[PDB]
């Protein structure tokens, strides 16, 4: 009856939410049962608290949705759970620091008991670790929300900036040299070969595969290994939120202006079959693109320009391992001690974003004002703070959003008879 | 003419009678009465100021629950001393990890735009103080403080403070 | 817990006194320490100097900078910076974490208000030297 | 059997595309155009969002 | 005293110093305890040494050596290493193959800022008047 | 202040401890336990014996068999009977020990040295008040 | 109209109503006494603990069945002296065959478990019971006890 004989249930619901810039917050979670089709249509408005000065830059607003099967979370506790049936032991909960606000990142008001089922928490983690966070950053392993930061939990946890020379460098581990073990006076010609082979495999494998699923595919085989626990991406949409200004009219102002932002957005997910019981997270993330008051083009701040820098001589750029640059090679007042590997030639593949110096030292301007410091993580993850400068009330945090979630899911639960 | 609907300070609808009867001006200025939450109006018809060199003050405890570091604090007061002590007044901001009784060691002072006349003093002005605590364990307090090299005398009057963390409404008939 | 903070703050002043190197130029030094005021346009040289005192030897010799805790930066400021202008010197150093947080694995970046009230405290109980009590510094100047 | 969409008329992948030709918002029965996969090239050809 | 956390480490040191000697050569102990500035080439020698003391302080008490306590590396860097190098000494220990900073499971290699935060705290209120002939 | 679940149980154990007067320590062990003297190598054996008795208490006085105890009960014990000079060894003595959670949920997750130390310390401080080291149980 | 385990236990302690459970004024003393339990009393330990367990159940309609670990813990937490909590948990561990209770249902009680729950109940953490009763409830509903 494989069962097409299901009825549609109306799980649609308005949700007045709000959150913080630079941090991934969940917007709504609808628990799905197995064999459901779940279909969503989200419409609403995105705003930024009243800015200090007129509108200057806009922000990209990505809204996601993922499918996280309970199985990835209570592994084999869940398999017994379902086989066992009415007799299974009730499934773990996870604890939360006792404030009303603090399960915020999961889209629920922390229940009075300071408990939240594991799936809701482990999902978010299982997500952040797979889709945001640079592949090089360490997996976030946390048991219960008791282990979070007021910042990290009452708002969502911080994501990466937008991709760009100093925010998306090559993985810090990327080799700059492979040594072979040669004997004094002789190389083993046949050994060299094997040595390159081992590179080539490593190389691709590090960038071009990662998952078990990938290895096998390389042999031209297939396997449904779930245990990598990678949640599904279902939909994902992206807007650039802008608009308005509010010209002032009394004597003191006139030339003064605010910057009301309103972009309305629809974010839809089409009929998705739901393989097995599980929770469906949506999530939203707002980021202002980075733009520094102090970023300079490499070629203008590296110093004496040599042949491998301006030639663009593909041969070299072709056969030359990454180069270490330093924040000082890219920012005025950047820290030379702190370096990052960059593929040779990125200068010719990317261009800055110059913010004339008349702004640096002005207040309202969601720029970046001063090159981050700290290891490449603390440099790549957004600091939700340097935006408080361009707002007048962070009461409703940095972004409001009145939203209305149209969600119909066709499951077969019986009727209100019995 | 149209009625003004804006004011520098809004008092609490409920005023408290100072229970104490004598303060002794000091460097560790005493706190006239235990601090209340966000707003309170304190009135005393006979407070005997002993001789001393320092000041006494009146507290309100910053309700640090709304995410906003800088908030407006108000103070409105009318105090009359039997004698002219030649004192200066000011709003103070000191934090403490415990119910204060005396102005601690580290405190800050901000000018108010009141008017002095001999033994008198009236004011209604507001000032923006950073209400979140500068040091982790504390609670931050703001109060009105008079300070001088006191000679025994008495004073009458009221002194009310409020922390603008929310607005109050009032009938604007033309709406 | 403030006593521990204070304790660790003073303890760092002892370390600072064992300067092995300072990179500053006679002038940068007349800039870190003078009564002369720092206008907004100086905030960067300010940071170069304060930083030059926080990571000094590490730099001179070639080891990489690693993050210093707040209790240390407070010493550096209380000891080298003039009182007129500790505010900007703190405004420009906001961010670092207190040892406790580092230890506890909690992220607590520190904003201006904190660094200033803390350093101000340190300055008051740090008769360890004013700087005044050591002309020696000018020995370890630069080069 | 199976479908995936675009990257970064409606959906894409040509074969998939054709099966998305079906539905009838009205047929409650399980449809093939249900199922899925999505691709934001940042990730596929990159690492994170 | 919040130093409730370091007392054993300090305890072992006292005993060690007075009662015995640790595996370090004569100029090595100089290296560790002296005013000499540690230049870049002195790394291996820096590890070689600070390691030495830590294993030592550890044996005496009765702790094993692989899970090596972050609090002992603190005491040693705190006591033997001259103040001119209490900073650089921390760096040289970052991610030493013996310690594990464990935070909720997460056995993460020790980052050199927590070593310095630990040492800058042991030193907070204790006797460290150490040079020795 | 907060102090939730794990800590709340740490407190609760301290209360059980005050009341469970009963131990299997001979006067001098109680000294050894509480001594401000450090513990060295050769001493270990008594250290085990003493700390252990301080945990399985009433079960040792009357000989019934043992019981693996939860990481919170173990820290209460160490917070209550061990000199701060010696909290650290008190723990390597009591290593694999699951927190109540894991015991309840079925997730065996043994705790090690550093972890119990962190916890004991946290327990130590929340009990500063209830810590009263009043030796009104110095018997048998 | 629904009185729950946990409230039953505190109620019965409040007004020491041994009568409600099936303890004699004397039994109640063993349970709640400041006396170390010796292995000669062991049997009366269980006798009484079980008596509190299956008693309150009967008091709150749960037709019998076995008792869930978490229920035994509550008993061992409200009715036993802090001197024996250890030995009490030791006395309930394992399936000693019973009175007339359902066979094919006896699943050995782990010991530590018993103590982990008693500490939590002894600490302000009532949810272990609450959650635990519902599971019980639902089992009993599919079974037709409602």
XYZ file of C-alpha atoms in Angstrom, chain F residues 7-131:
125
model
C 26.894 19.759 40.616
C 23.581 19.262 42.327
C 24.489 15.626 42.767
C 27.952 16.499 44.005
C 26.289 18.466 46.794
C 23.875 15.670 47.578
C 26.754 13.305 48.050
C 28.463 15.621 50.464
C 25.323 15.479 52.534
C 25.414 11.646 52.486
C 28.979 11.834 53.552
C 28.496 14.087 56.516
C 25.894 11.593 57.732
C 27.644 8.391 56.861
C 29.853 8.586 59.801
C 31.151 5.102 59.071
C 34.585 4.301 57.653
C 37.117 1.479 57.572
C 40.087 3.621 58.464
C 42.298 3.183 61.525
C 43.101 6.416 63.326
C 46.376 6.834 61.525
C 44.940 6.320 58.137
C 42.538 9.051 58.859
C 45.641 11.039 59.507
C 47.328 9.853 56.313
C 44.176 10.747 54.395
C 43.949 14.177 55.866
C 47.627 14.873 56.279
C 49.035 17.943 54.803
C 52.124 15.886 54.015
C 52.436 15.017 50.274
C 52.207 11.496 49.148
C 55.138 9.879 47.534
C 55.742 6.763 45.575
C 56.162 4.122 48.152
C 52.987 5.451 49.911
C 50.598 4.741 47.049
C 49.389 1.392 48.481
C 47.930 3.055 51.541
C 46.660 5.839 49.436
C 44.578 3.373 47.477
C 43.400 1.634 50.575
C 42.525 4.854 52.289
C 40.824 6.675 49.511
C 38.981 3.607 48.494
C 37.666 3.065 52.024
C 36.596 6.627 52.080
C 34.252 5.737 49.173
C 32.849 2.307 49.770
C 32.581 3.276 53.417
C 29.806 1.502 55.258
C 30.301 -1.384 52.887
C 33.781 -1.862 54.089
C 33.101 -1.517 57.772
C 30.724 -4.463 57.447
C 32.141 -6.572 54.723
C 29.567 -6.695 51.874
C 30.960 -6.585 48.378
C 31.811 -3.520 46.336
C 30.157 -1.092 44.064
C 31.498 1.000 41.241
C 30.622 4.561 42.246
C 29.646 7.586 40.078
C 32.082 10.437 39.352
C 30.150 12.840 41.460
C 30.140 10.738 44.619
C 33.837 10.202 44.100
C 34.521 13.900 43.943
C 32.484 14.637 47.024
C 34.707 12.215 48.822
C 37.843 13.728 47.568
C 36.582 17.219 48.313
C 35.691 16.195 51.814
C 38.587 14.037 52.967
C 41.680 15.083 51.061
C 44.211 17.850 51.610
C 44.449 20.228 48.722
C 48.051 19.254 48.473
C 46.726 15.895 47.565
C 43.541 16.084 45.544
C 45.349 15.132 42.360
C 46.601 11.696 43.448
C 43.296 11.043 45.094
C 42.015 10.979 41.556
C 44.541 8.874 39.610
C 43.552 6.440 42.327
C 39.917 6.713 41.264
C 40.146 6.842 37.470
C 37.680 4.947 35.335
C 34.468 6.086 36.891
C 31.433 7.026 34.971
C 29.404 10.130 35.605
C 25.794 9.484 36.698
C 24.612 10.383 33.205
C 26.577 7.719 31.361
C 25.587 5.184 34.021
C 21.959 5.989 33.427
C 22.059 6.324 29.620
C 24.181 3.275 29.015
C 27.064 5.156 27.493
C 30.114 3.857 29.151
C 32.451 6.784 29.214
C 35.167 6.363 31.820
C 36.634 9.581 33.185
C 40.307 10.127 33.678
C 42.701 12.016 35.884
C 42.254 15.565 34.597
C 38.551 15.232 34.391
C 37.950 14.252 37.973
C 40.394 16.918 39.029
C 38.450 19.608 37.198
C 35.261 18.416 38.763
C 36.579 17.933 42.276
C 37.864 21.416 42.182
C 34.483 22.731 41.110
C 32.873 20.701 43.838
C 35.367 21.979 46.345
C 34.356 25.593 45.753
C 30.586 25.187 45.789
C 30.919 23.572 49.144
C 33.288 26.052 50.752
C 30.419 26.623 53.164
C 29.431 23.047 53.749
C 33.056 21.980 53.666
